[PDB]
């Protein structure tokens, strides 16, 4: 008789601390080095493929971003690394990073018209100044928030007290428009000393415009710093402002919550149990090395390039 | 002769990488999975057990929390996760989490009368009582601060400076009463436009009342934002204010500055070397599954139900 062990013509190679490039009979390739190179649906739910559109451009509806006026349920927001149509009017949403962290757990919005445009009696809806946001010509503004201009040369105090009678959280976005100088104020808002006094049960703000000369950005020398809040059930948002108010028109009733993310990467159609911003991955491997960010039940990111468990005899 | 090994009738279970249930001989368990279940004395020192009371409710003396007006040496600050009596009047202690972090290393506060009520000649300190905090059903505001109001149809500008004159780091809490409207101001503080100007060696602050309409919380619509400062030795606090002043009336000398923590689980007459929010681990063993948060000569938390170390055989 003779004791021994089998062999084969395989060429898969593993590594050890003491030896390297050791040939083995059969070893499991635990590292998923392959990706389909496309973005698809996660568990039968299509993502939100914001094409050349940012979360600022989505939630504050950009006229160039009109494919998302009524969005279905999703599984992970998708955005480009440096989207172009992103706050076409210059400025920056305050706590923007907080909001995009908060949207990493909401799988669905319902756009509900909390505040129709008929609820601005003494204020004008002739707001054709945002030339930085062209869409089919003669652009006016975003659609989800209304930039109120004075009517009959007057700007009465905007005292609204919407109460979230709905039993679900609402995401209300408003803003303040920082003018170039006093000339734009008196040409837009007859009151020079303007303010906003948003008054949720938990929130308390007194904003003022920081009017000052500023540089060209997107062919506009003004700014608009936007703000957001989560109005809870039975709570009541209290807007009070006599100027420089990007009032809200739509809220986003948070009907579903779960696990989502924002991949920040540049759409396929095949089944994908897991996704990566570079491209989707479909395998049961323990590990992967495509990108840090993932979503769903996935393998575990490892920076290494060759993880191969030797399940065979050299 | 005959070589061999020790065999017993034990049923101890240990795990190896290649076989997950090995019947081992008297392997010592190094994970203590059990506890007393109650709050014990850390090194023979009484934990501060804030019963239905908070750090904000404790430091700013809450009428529902009168069992800690004079406090002995402690180790913990045990609090309820959902504290019922916590800032009864609506408000928000600014940098409250920073204050909790500072209190996570202060083992003692000697309450000291830095500012007696006789040092308020032209201002009323008796009628400043809020229905949000009832004392056995009667109105009564916090006692560690005084909610001043106008007296003799006037609110003269407080301008008071307290030199530390101690070898310890006394803590000073004050606040600003963010009122509801101009009428509440004129009823309380005769000056409509008010400012709280605080000054230390390392702290310049100017605060203004955000007189903004807001929701009703705890039966009251106003707000009171509280602010804390630690005053280093030989330093001097300087309070200037013509309104909305929740002036300080007690302070908290740091007699002892050691190691502590704040635990949010809701008293046992016992002794524990190391405590935990749910129970108290007394046995000496490297690991423990009880809770993440511990302080003292404690074991190492591990999120696993089995770490029996196979000191023995089979």
């Amino acid at each position, epitope marked *: 008789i003779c004791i021994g062990y089998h062999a084969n013509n395989s060429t898969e190679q593993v590594d050890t601390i003491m030896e390297k490039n050791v040939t083995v009979t059969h070893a499991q390739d635990i590292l998923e080095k392959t990706h389909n190179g496309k973005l698809c649906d996660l568990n039968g739910v299509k993502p939100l493929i914001l094409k050349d559109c940012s979360v600022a451009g989505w939630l504050l509806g950009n006229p160039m971003c009109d494919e998302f006026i009524r969005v279905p349920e999703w599984s992970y927001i998708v955005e480009r690394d440096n989207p172009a149509n992103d706050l076409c009017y210059p400025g920056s949403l305050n706590d923007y990073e907080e909001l995009k962290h908060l949207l990493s757990r909401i799988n669905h919005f319902e756009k509900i018209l909390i505040i129709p445009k008929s609820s601005w009696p003494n204020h004008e809806t002739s707001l054709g100044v945002s030339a930085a946001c062209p869409y089919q010509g003669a652009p006016s503004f975003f659609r989800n928030v209304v930039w109120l201009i004075k009517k009959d040369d*007057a700007y009465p105090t905007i005292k609204i007290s919407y109460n979230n009678t709905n039993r679900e959280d609402l995401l209300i976005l408003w803003g303040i428009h920082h003018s170039n100088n006093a000339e734009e104020q008196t040409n837009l808002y007859k009151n020079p000393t303007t303010y906003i006094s948003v008054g949720t049960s938990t929130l308390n703000q007194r904003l003022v415009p920081k009017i000052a000369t500023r540089s060209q950005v997107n062919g506009q020398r003004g700014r608009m710093d936007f703000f957001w809040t989560i109005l809870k059930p039975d709570d009541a948002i209290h807007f009070e402002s006599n100027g420089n108010f990007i009032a809200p028109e739509y809220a986003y009733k948070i009907v579903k919550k779960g696990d989502s993310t924002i991949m920040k990467s540049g759409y396929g159609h095949c089944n994908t149990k897991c996704q990566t911003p570079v491209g989707a991955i479909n395998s049961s491997m323990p590990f992967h090395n495509i990108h840090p960010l993932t979503i769903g039940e996935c393998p575990k990111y490892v920076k290494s390039n060759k993880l191969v468990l030797a399940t065979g005899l050299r | 002769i005959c070589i061999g090994y020790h065999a017993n009738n034990s049923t101890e279970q240990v795990d190896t990488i290649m076989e997950k249930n090995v019947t081992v001989t008297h392997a010592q368990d190094i994970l203590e999975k059990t506890h007393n279940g109650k709050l014990c004395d850390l090194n023979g020192v009484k934990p501060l057990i804030l019963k239905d009371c908070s750090v904000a409710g404790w430091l700013l003396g809450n009428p529902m929390c009168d069992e800690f007006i004079r406090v002995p040496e402690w180790s913990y600050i045990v609090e309820r996760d959902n504290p019922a009596n916590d800032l009864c009047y609506p408000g928000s202690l600014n940098d409250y989490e920073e204050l909790k972090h500072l209190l996570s290393r202060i083992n003692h506060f000697e309450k000291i009368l830095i500012i007696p009520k006789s040092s308020w000649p032209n201002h009323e300190t008796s009628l400043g009582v809020s229905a949000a905090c009832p004392y056995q059903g009667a109105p009564s505001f916090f006692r560690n601060v005084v909610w001043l109001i106008k007296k003799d149809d006037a609110y003269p500008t407080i301008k008071i400076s307290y030199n530390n004159t101690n070898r310890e780091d006394l803590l000073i809490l004050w606040g600003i009463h963010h009122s509801n409207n101009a009428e509440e101001q004129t009823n309380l503080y005769k000056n409509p436009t008010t400012y709280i100007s605080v000054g230390t060696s390392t702290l310049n602050q100017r605060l203004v009342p955000k007189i903004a309409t*807001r929701s009703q919380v705890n039966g009251q619509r106003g707000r009171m934002d509280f602010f804390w400062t630690i005053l280093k030795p030989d330093d001097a606090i300087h309070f200037e204010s013509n309104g909305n002043f929740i002036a300080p009336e007690y302070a908290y000398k740091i007699v002892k500055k050691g190691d502590s923590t704040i635990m949010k689980s809701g008293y046992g007459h016992c002794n524990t070397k190391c405590q935990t929010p749910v129970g108290a681990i007394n046995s000496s063993m490297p690991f423990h599954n009880i809770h993440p948060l511990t302080i003292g000569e404690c074991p190492k938390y591990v999120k696993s139900n089995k770490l029996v170390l196979a000191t023995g055989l089979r």
Partner: antibody
Amino acid sequence: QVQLQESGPGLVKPSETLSLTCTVSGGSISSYYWSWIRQPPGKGLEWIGYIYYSGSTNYNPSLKSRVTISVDTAKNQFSLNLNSVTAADTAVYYCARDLREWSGALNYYYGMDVWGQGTPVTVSS
Amino acid sequence: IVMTQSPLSLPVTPGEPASMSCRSSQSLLHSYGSNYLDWYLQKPGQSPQLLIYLGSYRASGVSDRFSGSGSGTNFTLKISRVEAEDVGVYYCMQALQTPFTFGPGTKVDIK
């Protein structure tokens, strides 16, 4: 520049229905409350009632039982014809928009921006 | 709610500050903190015009001269500087509950 124009006769006798209709010229009858307020001679204003643009009705108890309520959104108008008229109901009847949004989730009250010029009704045998 | 204006007729002069008081018989502070009291002006032979709303906030097209204040049962209107156009009846109308009522009306006239 929204105008509220009163219509109908300015004459009526006792024990019948006085006719008057309010046409919303220059605006619309959408998303707004609409109220009628009377001014008797030598007396302060008295609020009769109002109707929501859907048609939700609320009355004054002083004239709850004998006020017809109606809104006709086809031509952008609303009409409330007082019935069982007595001699004491002689008053100048004014239209008015109302911005109460009193029910529902919204609540904002600017309040009675636009009024009609008024119709001098005269109840007389 | 029963309302009353303490000046039934406020004799004013041009170019001088003036004020009037309107008192209710019920806490007019509506939920959401707003008082829900309107001040209307009515010139001789003209429809009412909303001078003020929710106690203090001015209506469109109303000068800075008018301003109101009050939270409880008491309320006050204040004309910083009076003109001939201000002559007329001032109504203080509560809008808390469905049975709306108006004050007796203060006929501001030149002294």
